[PDB]
Amino acid sequence: STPIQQLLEHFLRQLQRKDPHGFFAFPVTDAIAPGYSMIIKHPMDFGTMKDKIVANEYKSVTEFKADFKLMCDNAMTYNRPDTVYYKLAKKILHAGFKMMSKERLLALKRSMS
């Protein structure tokens, strides 16, 4: 509904397309993941990121990237390396940081001249 909201909704869509199972769609709770609220002090997921975009809570692309990387880092902390959760998190962390790279953002900035 503002330019930044629209750009971030775009990025979120593209990241969520890489999670066909919806592993990261909603907050992980203790009711599904024993010890999660002890092990993971700052949970994050795509649903919560969608809400923050909607609420225009991200001042910048940096802040949005921070939330994305927190989500992936938590998945890689709580879950063992042979799991679907860990693997996908590692994968989509690198895919998303390529998508939203400093170089790609600079080009986007020149185009907004």
Ligand X SMILES: Cc1cc(=O)n(C)c2cc(N3C(=O)CC[C@H](NC(=O)OC(C)(C)C)[C@H]3c3ccccc3)ccc12
Q: How far apart are CA 5 and CA 1, in angstroms?
A: 6
Provide the residue type at 82 as one letter.
D
Report the residue number, 11 or 85, with the smaller CB distance to ligand X: 85
> Where do contacts with ligand X occur on this chain (CB under 6 A)?
21-26, 28, 32-33, 75, 78-79, 85
Q: How far apart are CA 4 and CA 36, in angstroms?
A: 32
Provide the residue type at 53 as one letter.
I
Report the residue number, 25 or 108, with the smaller CB distance to ligand X: 25
Supply the minimum distance, in Å, between the C-beta of residue 99 and ligand X.
20
Report the residue number, 7 or 33, with the smaller CB distance to ligand X: 33
Supply the minimum distance, in Å, between the C-beta of residue 51 and ligand X.
14
Tokens of 100: 């939203």
Tokens of 44: 């994050």
**Please, are residues 66 and 36 in contact by the beta-carbon 8 Å criterion?**
no
Supply the minimum distance, in Å, between the C-beta of residue 90 and ligand X.
12
Supply the minimum distance, in Å, between the C-beta of residue 112 and ligand X.
34
